[PDB]
Amino acid sequence: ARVAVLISGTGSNLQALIDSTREPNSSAQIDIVISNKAAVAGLDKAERAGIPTRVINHKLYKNRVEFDSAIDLVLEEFSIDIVCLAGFMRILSGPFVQKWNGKMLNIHPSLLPSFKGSNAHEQALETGVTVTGCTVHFVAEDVDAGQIILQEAVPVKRGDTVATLSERVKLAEHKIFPAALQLVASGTVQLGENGKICWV
Amino acid sequence: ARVAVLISGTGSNLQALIDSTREPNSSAQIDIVISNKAAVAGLDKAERAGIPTRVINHKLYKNRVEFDSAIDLVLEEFSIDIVCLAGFMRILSGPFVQKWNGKMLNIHPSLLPSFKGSNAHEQALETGVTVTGCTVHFVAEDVDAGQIILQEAVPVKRGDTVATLSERVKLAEHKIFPAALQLVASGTVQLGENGKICWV
Numbered sequence A, B: 001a002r003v004a005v006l007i008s009g010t011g012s013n014l015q016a017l018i019d020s021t022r023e024p025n026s027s028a029q030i031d032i033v034i035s036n037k038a039a040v041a042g043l044d045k046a047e048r049a050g051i052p053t054r055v056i057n058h059k060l061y062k063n064r065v066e067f068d069s070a071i072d073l074v075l076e077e078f079s080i081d082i083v084c085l086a087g088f089m090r091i092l093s094g095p096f097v098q099k100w101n102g103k104m105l106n107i108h109p110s111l112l113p114s115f116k117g118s119n120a121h122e123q124a125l126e127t128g129v130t131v132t133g134c135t136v137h138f139v140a141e142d143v144d145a146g147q148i149i150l151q152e153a154v155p156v157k158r159g160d161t162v163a164t165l166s167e168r169v170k171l172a173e174h175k176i177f178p179a180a181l182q183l184v185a186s187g188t189v190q191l192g193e194n195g196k197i198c199w200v
Ligand SMILES: Nc1nc2sc(CCCCc3ccc(C(=O)N[C@@H](CCC(=O)O)C(=O)O)s3)cc2c(=O)[nH]1
Pocket: A058, A085, A088, A089, A090, A091, A092, A093, A094, A097, A106, A117, A118, A139, A140, A141, A142, A143, A144, A145, A146
């Protein structure tokens, strides 16, 4: 399965995916890294790994559909089979999500359905949970509401901040994201016809 | 700390609390078990342990306030310090919750704030999470929205039903409920003046 990874920043999840897809038994290969923001560290990680990169400045487009259309063009150019959102911080339009239904994965730093949105750690700390975690899910049009592939719980420690909590959760992200991608790339897991997750 | 345990059924959480409060280092003692339903197994467990029991048939009262008033009478009779809701399946009125603010704990079979309400396992299975768990929290007037004391994650296995999931989650309930009660009974944890959880 040919994979695109979309990023918006540091790219630690990208790095974990790169590392896992170079294992001999990987069923996925990363053929392109796309960022909506220039000069982010994730682009350096891609380039160090010899992976092509494209920057698509969402700010330069009329609307979400035209921006996504530019992404879709690159995905078609590289004959992509699966899209991983790895720290990608832009909401995708409906028809783009529809097109890639069952082929696009996202990592989210909470145990969905808790704490949807862009500041999950902040919500988790404000709420006072002692257990949080991360989730890989299929992207459906409804944000952070697609079919869940894998999750891993992570403890919250007293005195945790976004900094320290996000560090602990990322160690879990870097395990379940590569594992989830392998499950989808190998055909072990798919979206079923009833739209829910099917273990083949 | 003198403890009342309120139940509505089988009483496995009650049994775990009984067992823990008989350890020499327990800071809690269970002085009364109250059920809103007759002939449930939790009443047999209490009686086998030599603990007084009272049945208060909510159906026999005019409204929630009068019913809670009957509970409160028993709590005062037994000079109770802390109330544990252990499978108690009745919503408590506002003034009763206010009175026992910071003194009443509840066990809920999900990782709050996910899956509030009476059918948490059903919701967890319908949603498709691969990680669920249980939560002990202080009871605030807003249902399943008081301050979280402890939580424990529990995996969901493929093919799980309410039966098999609830069995696995209960093993975790029987650990964190006794632990949470010990934290409150020993004064290690309280509701702070800002209303949030304070570790002393
Ligand atoms: N349809 C659909 N799309 C997506 S995308 C995705 C992965 C990331 C989700 C996390 C985010 C939540 C809110 C964000 C936001 O408000 N972003 C702004 C500003 C950013 C900028 O500076 O540009 C923007 O989008 O304008 S990002 C999941 C997902 C999905 O489930 N469904």
